[PDB]
Amino acid sequence: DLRLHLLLNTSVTCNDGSPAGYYLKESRGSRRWLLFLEGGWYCFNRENCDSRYDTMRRLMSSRDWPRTRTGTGILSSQPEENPYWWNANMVFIPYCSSDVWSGASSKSEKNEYAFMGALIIQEVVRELLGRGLSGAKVLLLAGSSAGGTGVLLNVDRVAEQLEKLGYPAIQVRGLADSGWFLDNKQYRHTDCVDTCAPTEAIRRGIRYWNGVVPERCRRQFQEGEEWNCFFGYKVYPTLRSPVFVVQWLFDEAQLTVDNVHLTGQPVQEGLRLYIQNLGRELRHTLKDVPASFAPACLSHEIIIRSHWTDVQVKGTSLPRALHCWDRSLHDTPLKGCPVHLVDSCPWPHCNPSCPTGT
C-alpha cells in the first residue's frame, strides 16, 4: 500500500481546483525512487472536459481519492511480482489534469479548468526532496499511456529542476510505457468531433491547456507546431536523459485512434496490410532506440499490470530488460543481458507470450 499525500502547495491543482497529490511508499535504505505517471486519455475543450467530469471525475479531481492504493507490477514491493525494483521508494502520481501531463494553466476567471500536469510533476518532486528524495541516486520517471507520453514530455525538465535545486548527483531516467504513438493515416477517416486523428486532438489541447513541451523539441518545431513533440519518435531524439521505451507494436489505443475496431470478424486484405504496415512503422521508429521493449501484441499498457513479468521478447522479459538497462548505465553490450528487444514478426500474437486478454 502507497499512502496518499495531497500537495502542500494547494495552488497546484487537479482540473477542478482540488489539490493534486501523490501516493508514497518509502523504502529507506534504498536510494532508488520510482515516480509513476498514471494515464487515461485527455480532454481538449469545454464540452469534452465537462463530459469527462461527469463520468471520469477521479481523473479530474482529488475529492474522491482513497487514502491508499496498492502498488502493482513495477510499483509492487514484492520480489515475486516485481523482480526489477521491488525495494525502491514507490510513488504513484494520479493523473488529474487531463493534459497528457503538459499543462501549466490555473483555473481562473478565464479558465473553467486548471491544466497543471507539468507543474504537478515539478511540485511532487519538490515536496519529495524533503521526504528522502534528496538522498536518491536514481529517479526513474515512469508512466503508462498518457503517462508514458508524459515521461517523454517531462523527464528532462525533472533533470533540469534537480540540477537547478542543487542535486546534480541524482540520475534522472525515463520509462515510457504505451506512450509512443504514430501520427499516421487512419484506416478510415473521421472528423475530430470527440477517435480524433492524433494530430488534430493535440493541436487543440495544447492551446486549451497552455501545454508545454521539452525545450529542444520546441526549438525544432517552433511556434504553432509543438503538437509534434507529443509524438515519441519526434521528441525522443531531442531528449538528454536516458529513456527506456516500452510499446506494443499493435497498441490498442493506436488502433482506436486509427479507426480500427477489431471485431472478431474476418480480416480483409486492406485491413491486413494496414495492420502489418503499422507494426513495421512502429518497429522502424524504434530501430535507433537502444533501450526498448516492443512485443508483437494487440494490447495496451504493461508496467503496472500484476502479470507484467509474463511477456518476453526473444526470451527476455521486461523486468530483465530493465535490469540490463540498469547495468548498462553503471559507471558496450552485456553478454546475455539485452536492452533492445523489438519483435520482428508481423501480426498480433505472433509472439506466444502476448497477454491473453483473460
3-class SS of residue 87: coil
- Binding status of residue 198 toward ligand RL6 by CB under 6 A: yes
Catalytic residue, chosen from 144, 145, 241, 317, is 145
Among candidate residues 97, 102, 300, 340, the one labeled active-site is 300
Minimal distance in Å, beta carbon 91 to ligand NAG?
A: 18
288 annotated active-site: no
Task: Find the length of the chain.
Answer: 358
- Contact between 20 and ligand NAG per CB under 6 A: no
List CB contacts of 38: < 8 A, sequence separation 6 or more.
Answer: 92, 93, 94, 95, 143, 144, 147
Q: Is 192 in the site for ligand RL6 (CB under 6 A)?
A: no
Which residue of 1, 3, 11, 272 would you call a contact of ligand NAG, by CB under 6 A?
Answer: 11
Tell which one of 9, 171, 199, 344 touches ligand NAG (CB under 6 A).
Answer: 9
Establish if 149 lies at the interface with ligand RL6 (CB under 6 A): yes
To ligand RL6, the closest distance from the beta carbon of 206 in angstroms equals 10
* Binds 187: which of ligand NAG, ligand RL6, none (CB < 5-8 Å by kind): none
Active site residue 105: no
137: CB partners within 8 A, 6+ apart:
31, 32, 169, 170, 171
Q: To the nearest whole angstrom, how small is the minimum distance from the Cβ of residue 94 to ligand NAG? A: 18
d(CA 239, CA 215) in angstroms, rounded, equals: 9
Binding mask 118-137 for ligand NAG (x = CB under 6 A): -x---x--------------
CA distance 325 to 319: 10
Burial 91-115 (b: 16+ CB within 10 A, else e): bbbbbbbbbbbbbbbbbeeebebbb
Residue 87 C-beta-side C-alpha neighbours within 13 Å? 4
CA angle 85, 89, 94 (to 5 degrees): 100
| Residue 291 engages ligand NAG in binding (rule: CB under 6 A) | no
For residue 232, state whether it binds ligand RL6 (rule: CB under 6 A).
Answer: no
Q: Which three cell numbers, joined as nine digits, stand for 328?
A: 548498462
- Our answer to whether residue 145 is catalytic in this structure is yes
257 or 313: whose CB is closer to ligand RL6?
257
Rounded Cα distance, 92 and 36, in Å: 5
Strand segments, DSSP code E, in 62-170 are: 68-69, 89-93, 138-144
94 binds ligand RL6 (CB under 6 A): no
Q: Is 100 in the site for ligand RL6 (CB under 6 A)?
A: yes
Residues annotated catalytic, as ranges: 145, 251, 300
Which spans of this chain sit near ligand RL6 (rule: CB under 6 A)?
39, 41-42, 100, 145-146, 149, 181, 198, 202, 230-231, 253-254, 257
Q: Which residues contribute to the site for ligand NAG (CB under 6 A)? A: 9, 11-12, 119, 123
